[PDB]
């Protein structure tokens, strides 16, 4: 932050001479001097260059063309405008947040002007930063408190060991000095909720529109277990979603509760939809209570909004139909549904406090924002006990938190405040919609097959495309209108190979081959398998990272139409088995895999398997108790009908659980077992595409083994 | 790491000319050149300067005086010794780990020598570093895999926001690039325990002498709950220590178990001793099972070794008398009991595998070592199930671990391996023993009172001082011999004010006033209150931080003997209440507080209160169930006899729990209630020394309120 | 105030090399470096030279010949003494007012040492000066309050008149900026006897051994008329 802009050359000498004298004075305090050209030149030095804090221009030249466009980007940006004798303001310059510092054209006084710019720049730094981060940066340059934790104390022990000097010189001197615990008086403690930590929690909830919010320092996987243990006593009933996370499954194994799984919607490509509106009724929930042994009235509900693919729900209908006093929303993929008018009424924070209910959200911080890993939040909207919810937060958070992540956790809430942060959320949406139009433009004009974006036929708008009932792009039968939304920054590329009715075709390329082709250039697909390609277009994807993805997609069509070899296209796959992948081309491998999907019938053995649910004998908490006593055994995959599993089956593809720990496969869940045996055959012929199931151990013959319980 | 040493000036020209030519060649690749004088000069450039990797000296001048002292410090340190024509080795140079690189004195070949030094230096970096850290540093300069988590992607989003540029320019560009998740193929995942993470768990367990060790990324407070949820089913019996931690209390409130509290020893100064040998008997444990309703055979035991003050126990006697198959040792203060011969047989890892038992330890990493915060380990010594214990670890660690802390967790185990790490553990002990002798030297020679170290009269040794039965320095009656140890790096300053029998005196200064006086110069007291001052002498405490503590202690005697004012000595205390602390001196405040301790009788109302235990009605897990249902109420402190509390009482001073959540104060625990009412009176007369109890809330009249359960 | 003294030479290289690295780091923040000779050389750099604030010497060489003579001349004078491994204090160093800052001989950390000396020097300035004078110097560097008396406002009107530029350039920029009236909130007023002016009256009386003392701004000739008009009514008798 040391860029000073000097716009507009008057041509006279009594105005350019003070500029030349100031040029030699600002460089003595480390400041970069730039000279833009016209009005459009200064506008490009703010959106692209974020390290600018000084704009020098003539006030009697552009008093209305610069005070309006700059105010729409940054409000507290200092403006070192130079006025004259006959200078005045304008009536249209009253409702604009600006910081204009006037000066004169006096010779010899250039030294006093340089001291005022440095003092004004320090005021801008001490304003846009939160008080928690301000106390961290001040303690590095001035704090000298000895005998504190940790033992390194800014890297003192690293300067005495030969191996410790390499780890300290990589990050930097200012990196280890900010690693302090609760051994500081002028910073308070995180568990005490006092001092700078008290004002930090009120600053995040005010920007994100909330009443009280904490700072989880162990990722979202930990924040879901703290809230789940607040409104679920031993022996109650919870309403967890079927499309849950690995951490959400362990929550059912740590508390003696009786969960009730929902019935989400799904298509044939593998993209899971959402929970229908009929499941939130009173006659639907109460019907499953009597059918499930040992189950009372549900007091907590876990809703995955959005899912792993990115599909927003309708919170305006759940907060009125679902009769749960503690409704939870797993907002681990949408930490931005507030800073844009196309996201109002789509989350729990949008709106107001529900009478007699409370909304919990675990907005991830390190997922789709800009902060260190292992960072999460707990958004509470309602009237809860402060002395009770505080004890549950200390059950998973240590007494010495890492302030390096805490400073970045609150930073994400400050980077989005104001018009400077709205240009990053709306900017990523405009870059995502532009990428969606570049696919349809290069599809009809191309000569052959081309990738397709899972989007409606009409994308001539900047909002969330609703999933209506008279469309064929989504392919969700019996879908509810005004309930399923689409995330514009969640572009899902649909590779050719299937039709629009859900059947198979004759010519197509699976998404597993494209996933490895993008890895050679440094692109890893977020979700691949059947015929989908999920990508993340958050604030970290600029115009360079977005255009680099389109160029790699055009190279795959050129290499496939010319029929190239595997060695001259996929060097990483050739090193796995050079003998088998010798005389093989890109067209021979793409056609042999497509025939195996039609032969084994993948879309049918996957849709019917995920629809039915195995018979849940006991609660997931009771299954973990038998494992600690040693009553577990390893059986074959073909010999397991009528047994209780011990772990959760997570087959890849897709990425959703199959059998929960504590269920039994009877005659109702017959297609469930057929889905596991089909992946063991298709993933054994060609190397590289082996079967990936988190729970199936590979032996020395080919047959996988599962972990069940003793009879 | 770029320091090259050139020792011994022969005086000739055919040997000094290649040195001058090499001086201009090594500077082109960023290397600092130093020229030591005699033999003692080179020895000071290694212990103090850890960034050295090149030693150039004549082989035919000091072939035995340098190859022996350097080998005792660093083994893999390269030695760029220059040999001659008539050069040979020595018989005494066979059992020494060195790396000697021979060269010649050729003109013009100085460029080829610089390439060999840079290549040898790169081999030294790629050897002393663990494979997990090596893969993290290499991924920064080569790995460019985009479209992955976290969202910042090396700090890309920070370059677009004005406030984000100030946070990216603080830690450094190489800091954000090293923040990656499990979205990397060549680094594996932490939950999968494969790849670099698989070899990292074996490298730590080998140095720390263990079979399997993990890396907890949420501090030690979280790792204690992982072991507690493995050998303690719902309805069993655990043996938790009375001197537990805040996280250990929440473990009893999350699992339906029946804990049995021990009876640790204690004196009058507030320093808690340890568990006697009689509590580990079979007739003592089985007697408390019948007296406690709903209690079976104990299957798990939690032993706090060491405590908060630093007192090692006797693991050689516990592992034979205590009949518990799952014995836990809370080693949250001794992460170094395997690098010195004066610590053998004092921890659970020392020795061998116990037949039919298993030892669990939670060594703290960010306490007395050198690593980032929120880092812990789980040491397992026994025969446990791998597929069962792994599920308990994933119930508290997120799926995307922060590799910045994981790389530093294994670094702490790598910085101590070899003789280079033994000089830091034994070096901190030598600096601690030297500090203990400087107190007794400045006590008799001084003219007046002086601080005293809680140590025996004979400290003329370098080992752990045992607590015998014929000594008066410890003041623990009915103590067991060869069971209580002393940590030399845990110096506890005993301020004058009490006698050696446990009564009170006439002249003394409390430790609370000294605690605030040390904060002015930059010294934070770890534990204070009655008449004790606990400090931490880790590896980070060098000779500068050690000598700075003695100077501040001598300044307190000078300011007190001359009778100075509070405003001219304690500026922080004067700003709290300038009106009351106006006409007050340092002698008037030190004498008024000492009379309040004798009047209210603190040592008697604290020793008898901690001895007796309240009547535990229900288990701590059952007390948390009534809090979620809204059956709590706030009552006065004077009206609570016969009620069940909801929170844990943690009064300061000292720092140990008083009443556990789920206990009742009857007629047996009468002194327990008197201890809470005594602190409310002594901490209300003079500002700054208010009553600090983690459980009692301050109202608007003076009387504190507690949180109990409804009848 | 920017003179740093480095006394004695141990002759070794692991102690003189950190001195050479610190020599190039202290000059970047405007600090003069002097190299005294023997013990009598450092004593002449304190009584004669008053702009000195840093004394660097070996702790294991003159631990009693320097900590006694310097204490007899200045109490809050910082002492940047470098200690070693086998270093300790003396029993005759308990009743002496000194400010000893310990360091090491580590290479590469010369930049961090320069930041500790600059902050220690700033703490020395903010301690020996009274709070009234300290608040006046900070108001000049940090103070953009407009529409206040007097009319010059740090010398603003002097930059417009040709004759006024000769009077403003004679004293200095920091001279006219320190001439402020009671138009400042964080400095209080002299007639109100509150804020910094309240603590200044109690500080002067404590130095000159008194209970209360004011500050007359019109010489002694005016102070004699204030006391005379307090204990001499109309028609009384004075001696
Ligand atoms: C990725 C994810 C998590 C894990 O996020 P972390 O911050 O790494 O713990 C938890 N829940 C959901 C729904 C996720 O998608
Ligand atoms: C300090 C301490 C802890 C907490 O350590 P962290 O690594 O910060 O989690 C836990 N137990 C004991 C006994 C402690 O002293
Ligand atoms: C010199 C003198 C004065 C005048 O002093 P000023 O401070 O200039 O007013 C007054 N009284 C006596 C006795 C003097 O000697």
Residue numbers in the entry:
A (entry chain G), B (entry chain C): 1 to 711
C (entry chain E): 1 to 239
Could you share sentences copied from the article?
AAA+ ATPases of the MoxR family are ubiquitous and found in all major phyla of bacteria and archaea. They are proposed to fulfil chaperone-like functions assisting the maturation or assembly of metabolic protein complexes, and are often found in an operon upstream of a gene encoding a von Willebrand factor A (VWA) domain-containing protein. Remarkably, RavA and LdcI together form a 3.3 megadalton cage-like complex, consisting of two D5-symmetric decameric LdcI rings located at the top and bottom of the cage, surrounded by five RavA hexamers.
Building further upon these results, we now present a higher resolution cryo-EM structure of the LdcI–RavA cage in the presence of ADP, obtained without symmetry imposition. This results in a seam that always faces either towards the upper (orientation A: “seam up”) or lower (orientation B: “seam down”) LdcI decamer, and never towards adjacent RavA hexamers. Therefore, the occurrence of only two opposite seam orientations of RavA spirals inside the LdcI–RavA cage may be explained as follows: (i) the lateral RavA–RavA interactions impose local geometrical constraints causing ATP hydrolysis to occur solely at the active sites formed between RavA monomers 3–4, and 1–6 in the hexamer, or (ii) binding to LdcI stalls RavA in an inactive form by preventing ATP hydrolysis from proceeding in a progressive fashion. If, while bound to LdcI, RavA is able to exert its potential protein-remodeling capacity, then the existence of these two classes tends to suggest that ATP hydrolysis by RavA would cause a breathing motion of the LdcI–RavA cage, thereby transferring mechanical force to remodel substrates inside the complex.
